[PDB]
Amino acid sequence: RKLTDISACSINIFYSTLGGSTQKFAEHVADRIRSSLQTELVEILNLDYIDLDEYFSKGNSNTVYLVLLPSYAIESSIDYFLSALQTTIDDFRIVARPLEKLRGFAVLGFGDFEQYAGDLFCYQAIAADQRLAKLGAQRIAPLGVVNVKLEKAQVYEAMEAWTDLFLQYAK
Ligand SMILES: Cc1cc2nc3c(=O)[nH]c(=O)nc-3n(C[C@H](O)[C@H](O)[C@H](O)COP(=O)(O)O)c2cc1C
Ligand SMILES: [Mg+2]
Ligand SMILES: [Mg+2]
Ligand SMILES: [Mg+2]
Ligand SMILES: [Mg+2]
Ligand SMILES: [Mg+2]
């Protein structure tokens, strides 16, 4: 089986969304991974409605975490996700590197390169990528970033390319 080929027991796809698009993209990435690995062991999880302590201050051995995250320059629920990661990083009550037992992680960022070019472009996905590594999760693939101001056809090939690249790194 292909899941065992990537030394994983299952794949968790976390996302956050305000306008709904990242949720659709997460569903599409999930369906692509189900087909490629011919597995049903792929979960999609909305970061706003799960207990973050259950997934990011402790981790099921050999799980892959994919994190799909838009960035918002305004206050949003994504701020809470990032704050929760940092709190776990600094909290003496939690041992260091609690996610070292995972297979690993990879982050795919979505953002608006036309209005937020520069420091703000996919800045929260950048932060999430930095913080997951500090929690001890092995970075399986380098951070991906998608400019959603491209034509929608280009947005989908960008995320499908990233998904296929992740699966090759995961081998
Ligand atoms: C109010 C607002 C602020 C945004 N700020 C950023 C930003 O700081 N950096 C970035 O890359 N994209 C930014 N964007 C673009 C969004 O991240 C992008 O539209 C994303 O696809 C939204 O995802 P969603 O539909 O799942 O909520 C912003 C969009 C809005 C509406
Ligand atoms: Mg959300
Ligand atoms: Mg998006
Ligand atoms: Mg925000
Ligand atoms: Mg982003
Ligand atoms: Mg990454």
Residue numbers in the entry: 78 to 248
Which text from the study accompanies this structure?
We determined co-crystal structures of the flavodoxin-like domain of the putative Tyw1 from Schizosaccharomyces japonicus in complex with flavin mononucleotide (FMN), exploiting an unexpected anomalous scatterer present in the recombinant protein. Our results show how eukaryotic TYW1 enzymes bind the coenzyme FMN and will help further elucidation of the structural enzymology of 4-demethylwyosine synthesis.
The S-adenosyl-L-methionine-dependent tRNA 4-demethylwyosine synthase TYW1 catalyzes biosynthesis of 4-demethylwyosine (imG-14), the precursor for wyosine, the hypermodified guanine-derived nucleotide present at position 37 of phenylalanine tRNAs of archaea and eukarya. Eukaryotic TYW1 enzymes contain N-terminal flavodoxin-like and C-terminal radical-SAM domains.
